[PDB]
């Protein structure tokens, strides 16, 4: 079962949507995988929204990213499966953190925005 501190966890459909978005971004180079890269993105400001893995053990290695997001007002979720996330990113190896980055002239801008909105809805 998934971690309590990994919050907000997505729901299934939402998770799927997010992964699709990630995949799209990966194809368009508008994504960055990896805790450290996510952090970098956040620092820059380029992060549109952050996707983490709930099933990161030891969860602690993420649980700065959420804080960062909060302090930068970037929405964020955890999805459940790090394997799935990795696959979406385009990496066989299992991944914990990714960042869909900003770029006005993306084909997938609209889609990304939708996902962002959804993420925001979750937060409270």
């Amino acid at each position: 079962a998934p971690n309590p501190k990994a919050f907000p966890l997505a729901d299934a459909a939402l998770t799927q949507q997010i992964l699709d978005v990630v995949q799209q971004a990966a194809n368009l180079r508008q994504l960055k995988k990896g805790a450290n890269e996510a952090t970098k993105t956040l620092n820059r400001g380029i992060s549109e929204f952050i996707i983490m893995a709930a099933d990161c053990e030891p969860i602690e290695i993420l649980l700065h990213l959420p804080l960062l997001c909060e302090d930068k007002n970037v929405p964020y979720v955890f999805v459940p499966s790090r394997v799935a996330l990795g696959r979406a990113c385009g990496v066989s190896r299992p991944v914990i953190a990714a960042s869909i980055t900003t770029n006005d002239a993306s084909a997938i801008k609209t889609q990304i925005y939708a996902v962002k909105d959804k993420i925001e809805t979750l937060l409270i």
């Binding site: 450290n36 952090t39 620092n43 030891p58 602690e60 290695i61 804080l67």
Partner: protein, 415 residues
């Protein structure tokens, strides 16, 4: 007392103006003994508070900024007297010390103690550094008595303030080190306490350190990279810098330093993150242990080379002629390896005649041979025997890629 430090912070911030700093300097001067002394005293006094930090985490970046500003000011003052000095000596404290030494005077034209003072008084000055400094002096330093005595006085003042600031910073770092096993236990476990302090101090808080992404950590606490100073090492680590100096890296051989260093950085970062996450007095320190173990394992693996392989045999020499192929597609490839028609011609040498040689400076030996037609030979050269496109030396995949990269870099530079 306990209460002062926000005032100190405020004072530090007020300095965050720009050079020229003159009445500002005077203000700056005032700020110095007022504040930069009391803090030291407080530090010296054990048991004043444990929640000084995160105000010491708030202040250290400010302090750093202040120091930088001071350094800049100093450089401004000195430039046009000794422009290259900044280039030659990076570290601001060190620079200040050098300046002081340079000003000192007495037998400084010949030799004080000139090249003695540097080594002892400006502690850090390494032989290489010193040599470069000397060279610079010989060329670029003007040594015509200072633009004014006033100017000299000002620079002295700057040095005094800057030095004091540096001392304060050092004290703070020491304090952090003393505390760290409570601050960032995991990091300490991974690396060592002094190193942790150095890293953490540089960052700001542990939160700051965490925020720093792994790749950056390596080059925290590097000696600012002077182009003239040699760099390459058998190690292949480019970063040097605090972490690299740790046991965890420096215990293994030089083959593994680079990879090991890289590993360390990421694990250090992870540790920092963990520390940030955990609330005071949890001091879990299990993840860090695991990481350390893993690091060790990795190192061991790197050290341990591959098994001797079964010395792969030659194939049974059988003489098969199976191929028989041809095809525009397949011809080309093979055209690269086939002797060309002009080479075939060359390989024929006319029989009687003293057959035509190109004296190439490296070796005259070379006979064209019956490539060049009789009449042609009698007159001059040929581009009919510059025939082929199908063997014009093309690059490798790797080489091509490299060239592309280079081109890209060039383009970037041009922008």
């Amino acid at each position: 007392p306990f209460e002062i430090l926000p005032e100190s912070i405020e004072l530090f911030r007020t300095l965050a103006l720009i050079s020229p700093d003159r009445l500002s300097l005077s203000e700056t001067a005032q700020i110095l003994p007022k504040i930069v002394d009391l803090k030291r005293i407080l530090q010296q006094q054990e048991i004043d508070f444990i929640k000084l930090l995160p105000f010491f985490n708030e202040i250290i970046p400010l302090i750093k900024s202040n120091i930088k500003l001071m350094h800049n000011f100093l450089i401004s003052l000195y430039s046009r007297r000794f422009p290259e000095l900044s280039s030659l000596i990076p570290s601001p404290l060190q620079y200040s010390k050098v300046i002081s030494i340079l000003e000192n005077e007495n037998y400084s034209k010949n030799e004080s103690d000139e090249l003695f003072f540097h080594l002892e008084n400006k502690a850090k000055l390494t032989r290489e550094q010193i040599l470069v400094l000397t060279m610079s002096m010989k060329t670029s330093f003007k040594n015509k008595e200072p633009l004014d005595i006033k100017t000299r006085t000002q620079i002295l003042e700057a040095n005094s303030i800057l030095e004091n600031l540096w001392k304060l910073q050092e004290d703070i770092g020491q304090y952090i080190a003393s505390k760290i096993s409570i601050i960032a236990p995991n990091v300490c476990f991974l690396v060592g306490p002094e190193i942790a302090a150095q890293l953490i101090a540089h960052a700001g808080g542990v939160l700051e350190f965490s925020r720093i992404p792994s790749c950056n950590i390596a080059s925290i606490g590097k000696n600012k990279h002077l182009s003239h100073e040699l760099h390459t090492l058998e190690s292949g680590v480019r970063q040097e810098g605090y972490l690299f100096a740790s046991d965890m890296i420096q215990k293994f051989p030089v083959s593994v330093h680079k990879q090991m260093l890289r590993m360390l950085c990421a694990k250090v970062s992870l540790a920092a993150r963990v520390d940030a996450g955990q609330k005071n007095g949890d001091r879990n320190t299990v993840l860090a242990h695991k990481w350390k173990a893993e690091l060790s394992k990795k190192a061991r693996k790197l050290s341990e080379a591959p098994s001797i392989s079964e010395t792969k045999a030659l194939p049974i020499p059988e003489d098969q002629p199976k191929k028989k192929r041809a095809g525009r597609k397949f011809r080309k490839y093979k055209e690269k390896f086939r002797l060309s028609h002009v080479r075939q011609l060359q390989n024929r040498m006319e029989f009687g005649k003293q057959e035509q040689t190109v004296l190439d400076s490296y070796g005259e030996e070379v006979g064209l041979g019956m490539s060049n037609t009789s009449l042609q030979q009698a007159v001059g050269a040929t581009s009919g025997s510059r025939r082929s496109a199908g063997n014009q030396a093309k690059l490798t995949k790797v080489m091509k890629h490299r060239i592309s990269e280079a081109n890209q870099q060039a383009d970037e530079f041009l922008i």
